[PDB]
Each structure stands twice: as C-alpha cells, then as structure tokens.
Design a protein around this nucleic acid. Structure first.
Ligand code: ZZX
Ligand code: ZZX
Ligand code: MG
Ligand code: MG
Ligand code: MG
Ligand code: MG
Ligand code: MG
Ligand code: MG
Ligand code: NH4
Ligand code: NH4
Ligand code: ZN
Ligand code: ZN
Lengths: 180, 368, 368, 180
DNA sequence: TGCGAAATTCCATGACA
DNA sequence: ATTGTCATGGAATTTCGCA
DNA sequence: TGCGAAATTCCATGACA
DNA sequence: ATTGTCATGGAATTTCGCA
C-alpha cells in the first residue's frame, strides 16, 4: 500500500441554508484528506449546477483522484456523475444515515457560527480569512498545519492566536435572540 | 580677437597657429594658405556666431557641422568650438537618438519560496467575451504557478475582487507590479497594508522588470490562439483550461512543471508523474525542498562593446513615454542622485523631482 | 502492435528493444524496468493517440511533450513519434514563433546616375497643418537629393500632381515604391507608362527594401521636430526649409551633400564650397563624374549563427501582415518556387498564387 | 576672372496675359545663364506676390547668386528687394527700354505659341513637357543641352525630334481666327 | 574501449501593449 | 524607491547498447 | 624619427508607421 | 516579379607640428 497523498481524496459537503450574504445561502466545503487543506465556495443552492460551477474553479487548480460525499441530491445526480467521469475523478459515497476530516468539518461549522453572530450577514466577505485560519491551524495528530503539508513551507500568515471558538455569554444570549 | 590677429599678421608666433604657413590680409580679412586652399581666420569673438550659423542650417552633429564651416574658415581647434555648441543646443539634445547601449541585464535571484513574491499584470483589451475584456494574470515568482481572472476593466476594484479569491489560499509577502493605474491607487495600497503584503513597483515603462509575468502573458495568448483557430474568439470559457494546461506544462530547462514546484506532487491530470508514489509525504516534501534550491540560474550576459554606465552626478535624459507626433523623444537633462544598481538610478529631473528609473529609459547627455 | 509485444514477452529480440532489460506483463499491459522506473510499452497502434493526447494538453513542443509521455511510457524512438506529430499540428505550425534568423542583408549597388532610380514613400498622418496631413517624399537613389510635397491624402491623385511638378526637371528611368494603395493603382501605372518610367515595387511589408527613402523620412521628421520645439506643430510652411536644409547637409561618410552629388557645385547657400571656382564647368563636370563612381560602398555583414536560407521546393510560411487579436501570426505553409536572390523568394501559397516575398517575412516550416 | 557657372545668374521674366488655363494667366520664366536651363511657373498675375510664391519654390531647390530682370513692377518693388536681401541674392536690372539667354527666351515664346493653337486653354498641363523640351534641346554654340550642363549626364528623355517650331498654313489661318 | 545512433543538453531567436 | 524571461527546434555534446 | 596632441576615420546604435 | 540605410558622438587610428 502507498502512503496517503494530497489530491488522493477530496471530501465535499454543503453547509446551509445560511442568512443571505450577497445573495448566497450555502457554502460548499472541500477538504483534502491527506493534508486537511480546506477550500470554501459560496453557492445560492445545494444543486448539481452550483457544485459543478464551484468545483470547476477548484479543479482548474488541482484535480482529486477521488471525491467523497454523503448521498446529497447534488452529488448523486447523473449530471454530476458525467462531470466527474469527464475529469477522470472516481466518485465515492458513504452509506445513508452514518477522524481528521471530521474534526476539520466540525471546526468549520463552529468557526462560522462564531463569526456570523453580531453580523449574520457579512459572511461572504469573511470566507477568505476563515480559510486562512483553518489552513494555518496547528494539527494535534500531525506536527504540521495543512498549508505546511500542501506546500512544504511555513506560511506568511501563522495563526498563533489559536482562539476559544466557544460562545461567550453575550454571544450565547444574542444568538438565541436572532432566532426569536 | 582683433588684438591676436594683429600679432599674427606681422609675423609673430601665437599658440595654436602653426608658424609654418603664410598668414595674409585681403579684403580686410585675415587669411591663411592651407593645403586645401585659402581660408579666412575669423577673430575669436566672431567664432561662436559662425559655429551657430553652421549648426542651425540642419541641426547637424559634429562632422557635418565641421564640414560646412571648413568650407570658408580655418582656426585652431575648430571641433572644440563645434562640440561646445552641440552640447548647448537644447533641440539637438532632446531630439537626437542615443548611440550607446545599456549595460547587460541583471538576472535577479529566484524568489526562494512559493508566496514570497507575486508578479501581476493585465492583458488586453482582448475581443469581448461574455462581456469581459481583460485578464488579470498573477504569477508566483518561485514556482511559475499562475492564476488567471477575467475582468471588464484593468481596475483596482476588479484586482481587489480577484486577489481576495486567490489570497484565500495563501497570503504572499510581496506583490510586484508595473505602474498601471490599478496597482498604484491608494485603494489598492490600503488593501495590501491591511494584509501585511508589501507592494513593489517596476520602474515606469519597463516591462522587463516584470519579466516572469510578461513572459507568461505570451504563453497565455499563444495557447488561447491555438485553441481558437477557426472558431470565433470566445476566450472566457477557455481561461480555466489555459490556467490548468500551463501550470502543468514542463519547462525543459528546469524539468518541472509549475504545479510540481508548488506542490511537490502531480494531481489527477493526464500523464501525472508517479516517481514518489512510495515515499511518504514527509519524504516527498523533503525532496521538494532540495529540488527548489537547485534550479538552474541564468547568468548576466556579456556587455555590448558600446554600453554606458551611470555615475553619480552625471547628466542623463529620461525617455519620453508617449511622444506626440513631431515632438522630441527625450526629456530635458537631469542628474543622477543615486545608483541603486548598475541598471537602475534615481534622478533629479530639473523640476526637480526624484524619479526612480531604468537605465534602458536613459541616455547619457552628449558633449558633457 | 500486439503481435510484436508477444515476441518480446517470451524473451526473443526485436529491433529497437534493448535485450538487456526485463520485459514483463502486469494488469494486461507490457512493462519494462527502466533506470528511471517501470514504464508501460504501449502497442505500436496505440502510440500516435498517446503522443497526440500529450501534445494537446498545452500544445507543447518536443521536450515538453516528451517529458509528459515519459512519465508513464517507454518505447523505442519516442522523439521521432513526437516530432512526427508536431510537424502535423496545424495550430502549432501557424502560431509558434520562428527561432531561425534571416540571412545577412544585401547592400545593392548605388544607382549609377541621378534620375536612374527614384525611391518614394508617404509620411503621416501628421497633425493637420494648412489642412494637409501627409508628406510625399521622393529620394533620388544616386545622390540622396530629396523632394518634399505636402498632401491631404496618400493618394494616387496627389502623387500624380506632385510628380508632374518634379518631372518638369527630369524624367527618371525607374520609380521604386512600397505597395501602398497610391503606387499600385492602375491610374498610377498608366501615368508611369505614358512617360516610359518603369515601376518597381518592394516585397510587401518590408520597408527595408526602400531603405534610402525610409531613412530620409527619419531625418525629415527629426529636423521638423527640432524646429517645432516649443511652438505649435505648423509644419507646412517648414517643408521647403527642411528640403533645402537636408539637400545641403554633408554625409560624413561620403564627404558630400546630396546637392553636390546632383549638381557638382554648391548654389548660393550658407557656407557654399569654393574649391572649383577656378575650373571650367567642363572640368567641374569631369571631376564630378569621378567623385560619383568612387563613393563608399558598404559590404554585407556577417551571418548570424542561426540563420536559414531558402531552397527551392522547401515549405515556408508567410508572416501574417496585420494579425487580429488572438489570431495566428503565420499563414499556412507554402512552397518556394524560385529563389530570386538569397533574401527574396517566390512562393506558391496553397490557394495557390505566386507571391514575391522577403525572407524576413518568412520562416521555414519546422519538423519538415 | 572665374569661369561662368550654374546658379551664378538667373534671368527672370513674365509672359502673358495668356488665355486662362486653370485660372492661370502668366508664366514666370527662369533661365540659368551658364547652363541655359529653364524653370517655368504659372501665375495668376505679374505681381511681387506671385513672383515671391514661385521663386520660393525654386529657391528651395537652388539659390542664384544674382537675379536679373527688366524693370517690371513686380521686380522693382521694395517687397521683392527685401525678399532677395533675406536670401542673400543680389538684384540686377537692365536699363529701361533696351545671346544665349535671349535665344532661349525666344524659343519659349515660339514654342508656347505653337502649342497653344487648337488648344489655347490646355497650356497649364503642358508646362512640364515644354520644359523637358527646352532643357533637352541641342545648343548650337556649346556641344551640350542644358540638362547635360546642369547634371553632368545624358538625359532619359532626349529630344531627337528637333521640330519645325514654325506655324503651318492651317495654324497660321486659325491663329488669325482665334483673335477675330 | 571504440563504434553508430539515440538521448540529452545547449542556446539563439523572438515576443510578452 | 530597484533588477528580464523562457518555450522552441536544429545543432552540439554526451550517453547508450553492444562488442 | 619620435613625441603629444589634433584630425580624421571607424563603427555600433537606433529609427525610418 | 527582387535587394536596408545613414546621422551620430565616443573610441581608435592616422597625421601634424616640431625637433
Ligand atoms: C500603463 C502602465 N504600463 C506601461 C507600459 C505601457 N506597459 C505596461 C505593460 O503591461 C506592458 C507590456 O506588457 N509591454 C510588452 C513588452 C515589451 C517588451 C518586453 F521586453 C516586455 Cl517583457 C513586454 N510593453 C509595455 C510598454 O512599456 N510599451 C511601450 C507595457 C503597462 O501596464
Ligand atoms: C500600406 C503599405 N505599407 C506597408 C507597411 C505598413 N509600411 C509602409 C511604410 O511606409 C512603412 C514604414 O515606413 N515602416 C517603418 C520602418 C520600420 C523598420 C524599418 F527597417 C524601416 Cl526602413 C521602416 N514600417 C512599415 C511596416 O511595414 N510596419 C509593419 C511600413 C507602407 O506604406
Ligand atoms: Mg451533506
Ligand atoms: Mg501592464
Ligand atoms: Mg504587460
Ligand atoms: Mg509607405
Ligand atoms: Mg515608410
Ligand atoms: Mg518682362
Ligand atoms: N537579487
Ligand atoms: N545590385
Ligand atoms: Zn541643434
Ligand atoms: Zn499543437
């Protein structure tokens, strides 16, 4: 067996609906398995079409050997399958209804949730800093950040301020207000 | 003057007037019998006006001026007086061409790491496609890896939108550009400062300084051209294709593709390289660091036989950038303050501002 | 094909496949253990499609194509198959640049006499003056003597009006021009024939062929520029001044002014030459004939190390004259019929017309 | 004394009024003394102004040391004198009321007269051929034509057909008709 | 230990408004 | 205050395959 | 028959849409 | 069926003036 590598497997998934930001409602999350690198793309819908536009941008930078998703409608569509086949990408689905990637995905949700309070509407502008944070975050399991693993160098934006990521009593109270 | 020519007529010796010729008076003018014929020796206080009249016929340089003068006159050291005038003719100094080449180009060190330096530049206008007219081209200095963005205008606003997307991946230390309006606006400068990116600018009207990106523009247009043969020029949809194609093309001198230099491993693209399939990522990243430090570096070529080199205090003239019809191609003379390196100087212009400038846009003012 | 690779697997020898390596079967594909690693040997009937797929990624040339292919495959003589494809890629052949220089320029003999050959050409548009926009420039080949005429348009009609005035003085044997609309019209051709003047045309888009007149245009603009410094660009009134100034300016290499070469004596102009004041006109005309035959003639320079020379039957490509954005810079290949001289050829274009063309607007089609 | 040369003396004079040709009525005749070369310029008037425009064209080709004329109003004007002085040309007038040049001038008149019958109105177009004829005409006194003397070479248009120059009975009769 | 031919390297040429 | 670059295909040079 | 300096010649550079 | 040219000013080389 060969050691795991960048571009071996991209894990994709949707987050939303979110409070509309610049007419966008979802975030397509793309995470490289081996490095834990994250790419985020805002969409208007979890449709095959929006997935296809967004991945088209990413795969003009790097192409994964395999994409892995749950059985979301967008990903199980025959259009998406033709798309992947064109590009020589094998598609992989987890079975319906059931740690590196999973911890990453959890951080993304938790980090968004933290920043879309007091400003549930300005997230579109924040996506680039969200990614830089995610990608320059120390990995407990491996010595390195994802940036380090993907490029083989130190980054120019190190996030030394590993934050709380937890909601304070103010944020807690007025996140309960936003849905009341 | 008339004092000196009195001495000469009676048979004395004066410095510069070879004693061995016959100097006579005729029609109230002092003359001499020279091998070429009889010539008039004008008085010294006449000589300037004579040189000027000759020069002004066609604004001729040294020998063409001399040949007119020598038709009627002789005196000692004519060309000295000729040259003295040529160096004071404002029209000649700002119109004539240079005839000395710049020194040989520098070959700066490759940036050491991806994201150390970005070179960026616009291409266009191209023919409209999907209502876009330009490309923003960003080229990482170490790898050659290139990002392409379609725009409707070579504007700061579009540049900021584009770099906001790219900088999602990584923030570069420095971004290098030319002095196009988009890159020199303060809106841009703020954007850069916000993120601790340092802006570096080329000397004006010297695209060589950005040679990496300029050279990528060529390949971008070349591939777009091949792909569009016999179809309408709808390029917008092809930009991502071109991006991926080029980033995965080998430089024969380097034996690597920009992608390889950036990632240390091919992605799932045709003819991907399999040589490190058995190394761990850690081993792969280690070999990548080795490859990155041992790439070919070209050395500065030999100097042309008639190159010139800027010295502090020297009079030099900036090339006019967009000369109108029938207008001089060179600005008024100015002075070299500092020599940043053998190809770049700071000049005090006469106005007098400090201008950082490329030796290729200078000529050294003739006749001191 | 699959026939040949059967032989190879069992241990036989086939021409081109070095016997000393281990050739095995795996996943239904023939492989070989090469110093760089295991590579697949595709069947011969597979090889074309592989080379094509590699080339098409970015339309790469020989080595960049080879390096992709060599990532997965080995066979005997890969570059032969690589080159064979490159020579059949229409888009590559018509888009890529040449990388061979033309042979060294010719230096034709000076016309022997005034009025043997006229070179003519338009300058402009310049800024409006008295509602004129262009100059007609006529340069006698032997003397350099030059006539200047202001026009509103670079038209036959204006050219005919102008030459009717000049030809009052003398009729030339030949008039040489470039292929501008004014000179190639049949109205012009008739005018020439009426007077037994032979028209000679440059190869298209090759102003060097008219080097004498083109070089005079430069001096004309240079003097006009100097004279207009710090005034509005009202040049019409200056044309006659420029004409007289230049015709009476010395060429330092020749030591004569065009006027001198034309007349053998200066007229009443500043600094007129007096050397033949004591000779009769007959003696003066005799010395003039001597001067005219003994003028400096430059010799053709050394060839660059990578020049090419046209051979009859060779495939060559004409340069496209006014390439649109994102369109190839070279026409489809064509064939050298005749080699008029080492710098000029006749080509059969594919259409197929006969086109007389400058070697500088050709490149030799690569990969035969 | 120095031998006579081109540009030593230009002899100028007017011919007209003529039948209007393209709104022109006169011809300024310029003849070089030494060579016998001829330059012709059509004017609308024998005024200093038209003389000045026309000579301005010629003197942009060669400048005479001396111009010689009769005491025509155009030539004795103070404007014309300032013009000549600017150019360093000395002016020379024959006295009021009284052979190389003279024979030349006579030919010009005789040659015009011959060609402006049957077509008294198309002379403007003819000026260039008139000059070529005059300038490539054998000189009885000297071996050479004026072209030969001015340029030191044979011309490309030799006029081997030295013509009659005399009026035939037809031309005679219908030149008498034109003024009747 | 040297041959012929294939591979690889060299590098001038030209184009990036 | 900053600075030329590099794909390309014949030609030159090195290496390979074999003895 | 040799010296220093002035004159002349050499020639790369660049621009003619 | 046609084809580079030549003003320019430092540098290189030759000639001059004098002994
Ligand atoms: C307005 C700010 N601005 C200034 C000038 C206009 N500029 C800008 C460019 O991007 C380029 C450009 O790409 N090239 C082409 C070229 C030519 C020769 C070479 F060696 C290389 Cl490396 C590139 N030329 C110019 C130029 O200076 N033309 C005279 C240029 C620019 O944006
Ligand atoms: C339309 C017919 N026509 C064809 C082309 C347009 N053309 C015509 C001209 O008069 C010139 C011209 O003067 N120069 C300038 C130039 C450049 C380099 C040199 F070496 C020299 Cl001796 C002169 N260039 C071109 C040209 O070919 N540009 C691409 C040109 C012409 O009339
Ligand atoms: Mg999901
Ligand atoms: Mg630019
Ligand atoms: Mg550019
Ligand atoms: Mg032309
Ligand atoms: Mg031209
Ligand atoms: Mg009269
Ligand atoms: N450097
Ligand atoms: N010739
Ligand atoms: Zn001047
Ligand atoms: Zn191709």
């Amino acid at each position: 067996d060969r050691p795991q590598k960048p571009f071996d497997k991209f894990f994709i998934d949707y987050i939303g609906p979110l409070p509309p930001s610049q007419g966008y409602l979802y975030v397509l999350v793309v995470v490289d398995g081996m490095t834990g690198f994250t790419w985020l793309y805002p969409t208007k819908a979890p449709s095959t079409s929006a997935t296809v536009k967004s991945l088209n941008v990413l795969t003009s930078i790097a192409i994964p050997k395999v994409i892995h998703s749950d059985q979301g409608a967008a990903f199980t569509s025959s259009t998406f399958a033709e798309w992947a086949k064109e590009r020589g990408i094998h598609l992989e689905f987890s079975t319906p209804y059931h740690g590196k990637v999973e911890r990453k995905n959890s951080d993304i949700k938790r980090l968004l949730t933290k920043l879309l309070v007091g400003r549930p509407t300005k997230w579109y502008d924040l996506l680039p800093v969200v990614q830089l944070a995610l990608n320059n975050t120390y990995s407990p399991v491996l010595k390195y950040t994802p940036h380090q693993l993907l490029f083989g160098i130190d980054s120019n934006t190190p996030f030394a301020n590993q934050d709380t990521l937890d909601l304070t009593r103010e944020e807690e109270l007025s996140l309960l207000q936003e849905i009341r | 003057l008339d004092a000196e020519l009195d001495q000469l007529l009676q048979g004395h010796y004066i410095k510069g007037y070879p004693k061995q010729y016959t100097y006579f008076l005729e029609d109230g003018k002092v003359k001499v019998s020279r091998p070429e014929g009889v010539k008039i020796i004008p008085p010294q206080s006449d000589r300037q006006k004579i040189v000027l009249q000759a020069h002004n016929l066609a604004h001729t340089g040294r020998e063409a001026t001399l040949l007119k003068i020598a038709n009627l006159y002789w005196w000692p050291n004519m060309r000295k007086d000729v040259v003295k005038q040529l160096g004071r003719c404002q029209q000649c100094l700002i119109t004539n061409a240079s005839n000395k080449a710049s020194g040989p180009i520098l070959r700066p060190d490759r940036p050491q790491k991806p994201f150390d330096k970005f070179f960026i530049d616009y291409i266009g206008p191209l023919p409209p496609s999907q209502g876009y007219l330009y490309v923003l081209v960003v080229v990482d200095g170490m790898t050659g890896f290139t990002w392409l963005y379609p725009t409707k205008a070579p504007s700061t606003s579009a540049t900021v939108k584009s770099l906001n997307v790219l900088t999602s991946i990584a923030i570069p230390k420095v971004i290098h550009s030319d002095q196009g309006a988009a890159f020199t606006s303060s809106t841009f400068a703020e954007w850069a400062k916000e993120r601790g990116i340092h802006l570096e600018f080329s000397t004006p009207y010297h695209p060589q300084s950005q040679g990496k990106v300029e050279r990528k523009n060529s390949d971008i247009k070349r591939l777009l051209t091949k792909l569009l043969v016999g179809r309408p020029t709808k390029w917008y949809d092809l930009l991502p294709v071109v991006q991926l194609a080029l980033n995965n093309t080998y430089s024969p001198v380097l034996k690597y593709t920009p992608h390889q230099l950036l990632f240390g491993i091919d992605s799932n693209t045709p003819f991907a390289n399999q040589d490190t399939l058995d190394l761990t990522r850690e081993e792969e990243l280690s070999l990548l660091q080795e490859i990155r430090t041992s790439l070919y570096h070209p050395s500065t070529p030999p100097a042309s036989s008639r190159s010139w080199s800027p010295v502090v205090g020297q009079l030099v003239q900036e090339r006019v950038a967009r000369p109108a019809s029938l207008r001089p191609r060179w600005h008024k003379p100015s002075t070299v303050l500092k020599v940043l390196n053998p190809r770049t100087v700071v000049i005090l212009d006469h106005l007098g501002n400090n201008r950082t400038v490329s030796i290729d846009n200078l000529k050294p003012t003739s006749h001191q």
